[PDB]
């Protein structure tokens, strides 16, 4: 499933993301756009050792969820496979956990290179929330 900007913006407001750990809804949505183009099935196999990135938040297995051959630290306490799913609920709860670390939202690269430096005050403007 691919979400639209506003669709997602609505979803996240719903699940308590507006201002969650100092980050505005704009922020979260932008991370998403830049990380997966809003694709719940987005996946990226990293050529490192056993870390791949999952779902709309491109959630890494080295840290965050379990893989297969590839064991994890499993911060989020979930099977990484749970993220390649149409339902964004655990994807989000994992996302809220990621944010807690020192790096916060910079855990997410696309976010850093595409959104951190941007003025996102108009980002959501077209959205009925």
Swiss-Prot record:
Residue numbers binding Ca(2+): 82, 85, 87, 90-91
GO molecular function, one term: metal ion binding
Enzymatic reactions: Hydrolysis of (1->4)-beta-linkages between N-acetylmuramic acid and N-acetyl-D-glucosamine residues in a peptidoglycan and between N-acetyl-D-glucosamine residues in chitodextrins
Domain of life the protein comes from: Eukaryota
InterPro entries per record: Glyco_hydro_22, Glyco_hydro_22_CS, Glyco_hydro_22_lys, Lysozyme-like_dom_sf
Key words of the record: Antimicrobial, Bacteriolytic enzyme, Calcium, Disulfide bond, Glycosidase, Hydrolase, Metal-binding, Milk protein
Domain C-type lysozyme: residue ranges: 1-129
Cofactor field: Ca(2+)
PROSITE patterns, A to Z: GLYCOSYL_HYDROL_F22_1, GLYCOSYL_HYDROL_F22_2
Main enzyme class: hydrolase
Disulphide-bonded residues: 6-127, 30-115, 65-80, 76-94
Active-site feature positions: 35, 53
GO biological process annotation, one example: defense response to bacterium
The record's free-text note on cofactor binding: Binds 1 Ca(2+) ion per subunit.
Enzyme Commission code(s) on record: 3.2.1.17
Family, as annotated: Belongs to the glycosyl hydrolase 22 family.
Subunit-level organization: Monomer.
Miscellaneous comment text of the record: Lysozyme C is capable of both hydrolysis and transglycosylation; it also shows a slight esterase activity. It acts rapidly on both peptide-substituted and unsubstituted peptidoglycan, and slowly on chitin oligosaccharides.
PANTHER family: LYSOZYME C (PTHR11407), LYSOZYME C, MILK ISOZYME (PTHR11407:SF69)
Main function: Lysozymes have primarily a bacteriolytic function; those in tissues and body fluids are associated with the monocyte-macrophage system and enhance the activity of immunoagents.
Protein name (record): Lysozyme C, milk isozyme
